Symmetry: C2
Subunit: 240 residues, 2 copies
């Protein structure tokens, strides 16, 4: 009912640590599945587009508490953990209740220390550090993403990106297909992630379409309902 | 009485975090003084020769609990924290949850992480990170120490060190005097630190600690220890029981 939701194409654009205060979710890959339980912390690699089926316990509250890491913060944490330490199961990893998490979020300096501390206290840290390092790599898809990000309003083509990257169209094609993506999908993922964030933020549908680059908001509603499978209102009400 | 002791020339050869479980100590500089209170945590720089006057609460236990950092661990911690006057070399603080701190103390991938955590939680961390960086620098005196550390038994001269460092004797002299030390003093500090580390081991005895540190006669070593630290080796052993 109103406790359960099933949205697809969920892109972890930044490395996200995720509690499960008010939800039991099943995270789906193209071939794998990971069930996150309630009162547990989950580490999510950046660059992971996935489908989630959630089960809220209380209908009135948000399903979970999430914390994102900037690219900047992700590279400093990677460098710090490398100084210190020297498949879907590798990219999404849940753990036991910290039982002592005390929530920072405004002083990276204090935050990065606490994150290093939590990782050091956790077990099986090799895979956590591995996910950190992997998510700290600027793949070719990330560079095209950064390019498009500057003007989501602008209508891009493969030739524009190719000229910007000083390459041929087929080169960009095969690079993105080896990254398991494409230019159109990259663009859509960026726009729809910004749209979801803005929905849970204080733009609204009347202007989110324009902010992300779509002129007509009805087309944006249909495109959101296609990408995530949930109408923008259902997405808003499940996280409210 | 035996609750109080006053030993001089206490060299913090490794960056040491120091609790005060069973003591109230007064650290003395050539011109400054710092009184560490009971049930506190103390931060000390590497390369610090000081005097201490301690006051144990229970005569039967050790006065405090200390934790040292290897040069390797100190350099990692410095690099990690960079990624993330006597008052600027010795800094005490208050703690409530060292229960978390316990940790295993037998690893670098975990200890320095928990230490970073403690520092992040401690306010006024600026001077702490300062002390870390300063103690992570290999001064010329540290290079001479490392050279001598190889063969403490060997009898060194200023000319041997100078030839090893490809320099003149007066150069080594002025370098060490700018570091507020000298070759003979460097040697004495190294030997006497080891002596104290060889002490409180309850496994090694004077009859052989002098030989390990390079002194042939153990009576001369007793007199030299009682001169350097001001406490007879037996008093030093009994205060840290």
């Amino acid at each position: 009912a109103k406790e359960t939701i099933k949205f697809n194409n969920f892109m972890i654009h930044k490395y996200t640590v995720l509690y499960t205060s008010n939800c039991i979710m099943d995270i789906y890959s193209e071939e794998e599945k990971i069930t996150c339980f309630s009162n547990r912390l989950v580490f999510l690699e950046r660059g992971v587009n996935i489908s989630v089926r959630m089960q809220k316990q209380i209908l009135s509250e948000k399903p979970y508490v999430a914390f994102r890491l900037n690219g900047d913060m992700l590279r400093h944490l990677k460098d710090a953990l490398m100084i210190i330490y020297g498949s879907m199961s590798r990219k999404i990893m849940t753990t036991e209740v910290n039982k002592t998490l005390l929530d920072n979020s405004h002083d990276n300096s204090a935050f990065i220390s606490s994150l290093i501390y939590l990782i050091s206290k956790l077990e099986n840290n090799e895979k956590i550090i591995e996910s950190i390092y992997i998510s700290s790599v600027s793949f070719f898809s990330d560079k095209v993403r950064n390019l498009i990000e500057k003007d989501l309003s602008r209508k891009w083509t493969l030739g524009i990106i190719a000229d910007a990257f000083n390459a041929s169209e087929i080169t960009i094609r095969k690079r993105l297909e080896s990254e398991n993506t494409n230019f159109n999908q990259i663009l859509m993922q960026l726009r729809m992630s910004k749209a979801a964030l803005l929905l849970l933020e204080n733009y609204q549908i009347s202007q989110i379409s324009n902010m992300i680059g779509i002129s007509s908001a009805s087309y944006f509603i249909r495109i959101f309902n296609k990408h995530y499978g949930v109408t923008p209102k259902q997405f808003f009400t499940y996280f409210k």
